[PDB]
């Protein structure tokens, strides 16, 4: 905040929602509670400048958890491979993938 | 699956109804038959000129009213909380405020028609 009163008078107005790893109704965890738990206690009171370099290899692991960016890239590459030999007809899926 | 199947079936049946309605009955159009109806005589000529209705003020307030009916809709699930003391206070706030907004809307003319 610019003029921090939430800390001063000691009453929470918006901190409860600011993150997805905070306490949720009936303990419904977020999708990436494990990552946001680790990321938050990684760069806490260490410094915003002293955060983007050291709490990095843990941060993108979280940013991947939200968006599955390179994970979906993996599926696209695999599915792209399927199209390029199924038409060529070298391989057939095992019955596990049919029934 | 079922929901859009139900939706598709209904629009289809309606389309056929208007289709046989608008095609079958052996039309005969002669211009004055298609002329606008004006209670027996000719129209003065407009019907797209701005029809200045007098409930404009009550119109927008209805929009504000609906914006807060959406707010007070989660009450059936809100009652199943562990903090009814807080939930009851905040719930009664909305209705008190909604009445208060109407009360100002009422007392300072407002609801009354414009003449």
């Amino acid at each position: 905040p610019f003029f921090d009163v939430q800390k001063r008078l000691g009453l929470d107005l918006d901190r409860w929602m600011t993150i997805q790893s905070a306490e949720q109704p009936h303990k419904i965890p977020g999708r990436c509670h494990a990552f946001e738990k680790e990321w938050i206690e990684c760069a806490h009171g260490i410094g915003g400048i002293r955060a983007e370099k050291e709490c990095k290899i843990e941060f993108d692991d979280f940013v991947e958890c939200l968006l599955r960016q390179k994970t979906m890239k993996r599926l696209s590459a695999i599915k792209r491979q399927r199209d390029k030999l199924i038409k060529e007809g070298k391989y057939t899926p095992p019955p596990h993938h049919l029934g | 699956m079922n929901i859009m199947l139900t939706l598709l079936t209904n629009v289809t049946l309606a389309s056929l109804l208007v289709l046989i309605a608008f095609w079958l009955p052996q039309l005969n159009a002669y211009s004055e038959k298609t002329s606008p109806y004006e209670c027996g005589f000719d129209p003065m000529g407009s019907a797209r000129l701005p029809f200045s209705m007098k409930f404009f003020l009550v119109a927008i307030t209805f929009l504000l009213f609906d914006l807060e009916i959406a707010l007070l809709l989660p009450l059936p699930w809100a009652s199943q909380t562990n903090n009814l003391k807080t939930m009851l206070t905040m719930a009664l706030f909305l209705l008190i405020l909604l009445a208060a907004s109407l009360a100002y809307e009422w007392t300072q003319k407002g609801l009354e028609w414009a003449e």
């Binding site: 494990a34 692991d61 958890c65 993996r74 491979q81 596990h96 | 079922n2 929901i3």
Partner: protein, 96 residues
């Protein structure tokens, strides 16, 4: 009359939920095996897919962290029958 009946319905809901939680450990005990089995079949088959690839290490964790994550459903039902994935994702949401 409503106030008595509603409390009775509450009594049933705990009774309903108690049967749910008692049965829950078995349901969790089945789910992990199915997802592990599903992940395996994709990865065992992934060796055949990624044999002729110039550079694709089989079974690489997309995340740097070695802790297991909740597996992403997209790769769970990735190459399964198109009907199966369709029911898997939009099943409940379409069920009626």
């Amino acid at each position: 009359s409503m106030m008595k009946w509603n409390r009775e319905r509450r009594r049933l809901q705990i009774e309903d939920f108690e049967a749910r939680i008692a049965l829950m450990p078995l349901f969790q005990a089945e789910k992990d095996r199915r997802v592990l089995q599903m992940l395996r079949e994709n990865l065992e088959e992934e060796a055949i897919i990624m044999k002729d690839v110039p550079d694709w290490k089989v079974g690489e964790s997309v995340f740097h962290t070695t802790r297991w994550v909740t597996p992403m459903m997209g790769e769970l039902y990735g190459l399964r029958t198109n009907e199966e994935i369709l029911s898997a994702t939009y099943g409940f949401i379409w069920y009626t």
